[PDB]
Write a protein that binds this DNA or RNA. Structure first.
Lengths: 83, 95, 109, 97, 75, 109, 95, 83, 97
DNA sequence: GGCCGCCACTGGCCACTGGAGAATCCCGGTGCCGAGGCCGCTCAATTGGTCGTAGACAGCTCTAGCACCGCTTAAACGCACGTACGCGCTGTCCCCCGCGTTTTAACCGCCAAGGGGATTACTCCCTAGTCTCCAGGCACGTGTCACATATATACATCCTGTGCATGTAAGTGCATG
DNA sequence: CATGCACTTACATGCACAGGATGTATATATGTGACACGTGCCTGGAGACTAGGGAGTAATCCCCTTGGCGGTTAAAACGCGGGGGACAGCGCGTACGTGCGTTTAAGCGGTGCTAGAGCTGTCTACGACCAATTGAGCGGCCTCGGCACCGGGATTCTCCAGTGGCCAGTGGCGGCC
């Protein structure tokens, strides 16, 4: 029912892959947990708004269109999911 | 002969005397407050407009405004505004 | 013959103008109809925000022993509150200045 | 003798590869797990469109990657090639976060 | 050809006789003024100065290894 | 006695729907009245913009010898134009990837 | 069957064949172009509404559409958009 | 009438004043001209916007309302000028 | 000997003064001259509200001052106390200017 | 005869290079599933008329900006001398990616189930709109005290001379070679 | 007698403290205009009443979402190691900081003008509203060929071993003192 630790599901090699996409040549060992915290902050910031949209839509199922609304609210508009 | 111009002067000055009866104000600070209250008015109004579009509603209700407050205003100001606005809506409902 | 005039702001028990905000929302073109409680709720929210920021400006003015609110007082009140700073991170204020703030490495020794 | 590349060469080839690639680098279902875990902290027992999860994955990876280019700029700006969490804090403070 | 860089380093340190020992930068500028391809032979300068240190003919004042100041022994 | 129902996009020689965009403006609540040439002008502007971005996308797909345009090609086109990237810096394409970019200090000797 | 859902597939396909008869299109890229055109459309609609409000204009006309596209679009994109729109406005003016 | 290099009308000590208000301790000599170019880019953008407002307004004179509209177009909202 | 402060002391005092002060750090008349100079290039015979020029002012020091705290953060990141124009360039590019 | 300077012998160190190995790019081939084209439907763009009004212009007004001028210091510039700071170099130590191995859970993929998204209908609560009437907030005028400014002390603090804690080196008396 | 050593003693260096000087605070005196407060008004907002229509609600169903079960391997994780990088130390030269003298030009008061913002009447172009209608565009189907995956060869990149040049360590000899 409940979930306790899935932030560690964003594993270190995945962060390494993202950093190589980011052009980072060398990654410190202290990076990964801080990036987990930063990712947690960004995800909660968007998904609180998403929950707000979905509840205001009187739905209990989260739709991607609300995710688009939340992302374009925070100046992070995404192309490829509108409609 | 001059055309009348709108301001928030009386309301901000009276709520200032409510919160601090002994405190004055400078006029350009009132201009800043005019810009602030206007700016938040179009922020909430535009959020309410697009939220009315997203649920295809042509009528913006207090639910939309409250949702917009939860969106733009973060944390404690949102829930305090919800409580006071709910009180105001309840009093208007009794009115 | 007719009921006496009684304001809707008083009907909410509020100071912010219900009729003015209602007219501005109607002519501001946000929806072709508007719920009755929506502008009352809006005016209540703006009155609450104005009251709290006026409290903070009053504390700032009292700390600098000045009776009247100054845009410097507004700048100090907004920038020293992390909630209001995150509300207004992209807002600039005329003649506001900044927080008195130095880096520790800029200090001697 | 078993070959061993000199350090960073494989890292640069990784950079070229994943700049060439377009796919998501995050494991999909652990991301779904974490998204639902954060979701129940706001409202429990909700349902998700998988499209919403994929959109969150795309936006999250994009924000992270752009943060890492900013971090790389800060690190080389500090005349270093190894990124640090202080670089990330600097980048977030510049971005206004 | 000429003599190896050790003797040139000895005149480089003996040219000044400051209270503080000569820096790596100052001896590089001294070899540049006297004439040497210092851009090609930084490692040669480092090994020469370290070898002269190991004989005890030179004593390093404040730095360690090839950094810092370098001054002559008691005699 | 009606004439043949001709289309306003053809009247302006355009591809984008004049009537649909005019309907969107009438129901998107931006003003209660809309000048007749305004959706025509808007549709022309949109057609121009789509023409350039699609042309750059087809050029990029041809550069990658690909006969069917790709979101990767969309990213490569939209990021390699200065004015388009300045128009759309904060906007992300799903599955777009990133520009091939390595700093010179990252490159070996 | 179900209710009709609006899309821009046919127009973008026509424009694609205008610029490239030879090449194809992917449907996810089609969703990207729909997001793109809807985003630009709502942007221009927003500044049109704002500018009409600033001049207190009850009717939105082509001139402030021109103003808004000159405002948002950088440089030669804006000038050629003005040129194309002016050409189309003249042709529709001539019916 | 015709003005030629009023970009240098922003004096170097004024730039020092602006830096000290930003808490900058030590300023290179290379700074001032580069910052002049940067503020030039900033001013030309915002005045392009404000001008475009002004000829759309059918006015010959720039008003402060046009200025604040230009700033809020750039996400750089300024308070205290009748907005 | 005459009195002479060590370097940085006057800088600290004026930093405290100008952080405490709110008054304009630009001479007003050459600022107005530069505004008219730039604006004439885009449209001829442009006239200005003085209030419009003033709003253009506090916008100018607002953007510039924020750019200098960004630059100062870059410099203290770079272990320096003297700013260099590439720090400003870094701040602009990370902000996306 | 011995000792030192210079010339010659020799080994160690650094860069140059070729070649091997491995990752990658490039070349068909082929099955397969989105693309796109056809086809049937439907709803919304069109067409046409009307009515009412939105804004463009004529005209007029007064006002704010623009320029000029004339003093009048503030600061901008400029030079000069000095420190402290970027920064270049190097030593050193440790951190993190390359690589190989083990585990593991993610993912396909397959299937069950059911839940709520969505759609349709129905009826009604509200609210947009109209007319009437009236008081609220803003323009207008005024007055008056909070604050700006000036000036005189008073302390803070920062630099610097210098007074004490600590390293150093030399002189010389004394013991002894 | 002489000579080296050790002990004593003068010299020198760096850290700590008093003291001055100047900047900043801080206390008292003085005007003033800016904020605040009474006043006329009209205009925008409330009062009464209605139409109807967007919205709340009931029903359903099916499709999408959740839940679960097996295989498999890529994916993560773990360990070794060893190089590359961070970073501290140190110095150095320079380039701003600071300080003092000057010019000027920024700034303030006062004058004068008029473009130009802006208000008001007209009225006309234009667009919303409304009824019919259709055809264009959208939902669904179907085929295919472009392309993703697979498999094979060439290519390129890289890294490290072999090699020659370059330099310094070393030895030996002649010549002079």
């Amino acid at each position: 029912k409940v979930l306790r630790d899935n932030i560690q599901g964003i594993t270190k090699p995945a962060i390494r892959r993202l950093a190589r996409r980011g052009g980072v040549k060398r990654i410190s060992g202290l990076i990964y947990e801080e990036t987990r915290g930063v990712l947690k902050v960004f995800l909660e910031n968007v998904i609180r708004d998403a929950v707000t949209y979905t509840e205001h839509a009187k739905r209990k199922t989260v739709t991607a269109m609300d995710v688009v609304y939340a992302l374009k609210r925070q100046g992070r508009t995404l192309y490829g999911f509108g409609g | 002969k001059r055309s009348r111009k709108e301001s928030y002067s009386v309301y901000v000055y009276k709520v200032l005397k409510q919160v601090h009866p002994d405190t004055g104000i400078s006029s350009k600070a009132m201009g800043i407050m005019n810009s602030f209250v206007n700016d938040i008015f179009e922020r909430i109004a535009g959020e309410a407009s697009r939220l009315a579009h997203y649920n295809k509603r042509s009528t913006i209700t207090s639910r939309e405004i409250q949702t917009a407050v939860r969106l733009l205003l973060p944390g404690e100001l949102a829930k305090h505004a919800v409580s006071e606005g709910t009180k105001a809506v309840t009093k208007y409902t009794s009115a | 013959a007719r009921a006496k005039a009684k304001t809707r702001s008083s009907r909410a028990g509020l100071q912010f103008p219900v009729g003015r905000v209602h007219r501005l929302l109607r002519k501001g073109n946000y929806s072709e109809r508007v719920g009755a409680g929506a502008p009352v709720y809006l005016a209540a929210v703006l009155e609450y925000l104005t009251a709290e920021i006026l409290e903070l400006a009053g504390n700032a003015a009292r700390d600098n022993k000045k009776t009247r609110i100054i845009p410097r007082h507004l700048q100090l009140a907004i920038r020293n509150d992390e909630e209001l700073n995150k509300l207004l991170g992209r807002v600039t204020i005329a003649q506001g200045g900044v927080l008195p703030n130095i880096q520790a490495v800029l200090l001697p020794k | 003798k078993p070959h061993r590349y000199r350090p960073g060469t494989v890292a640069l080839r990784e950079i070229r590869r994943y700049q060439k690639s377009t796919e998501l680098l995050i494991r999909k279902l652990p991301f779904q797990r974490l998204v639902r875990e954060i979701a129940q902290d706001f409202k429990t027992d909700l349902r998700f469109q998988s499209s919403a999860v994929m959109a969150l994955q795309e936006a999250s990876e994009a924000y992270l990657v752009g943060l890492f280019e900013d971090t790389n700029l800060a690190a080389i700006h500090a005349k270093r090639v190894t990124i640090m969490p202080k670089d990330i804090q600097l980048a977030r403070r510049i971005r206004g976060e | 050809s000429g003599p190896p860089v050790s003797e040139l380093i000895t005149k480089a340190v003996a040219a000044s006789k400051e209270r503080s020992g000569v820096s790596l930068a100052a001896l590089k500028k001294a070899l540049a003024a006297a004439g040497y391809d210092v851009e090609k032979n930084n490692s040669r300068i480092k090994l020469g100065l370290k070898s002269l240190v190991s004989k005890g003919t030179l004593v390093q004042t404040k730095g360690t290894g090839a950094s810092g100041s370098f001054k002559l022994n008691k005699k």
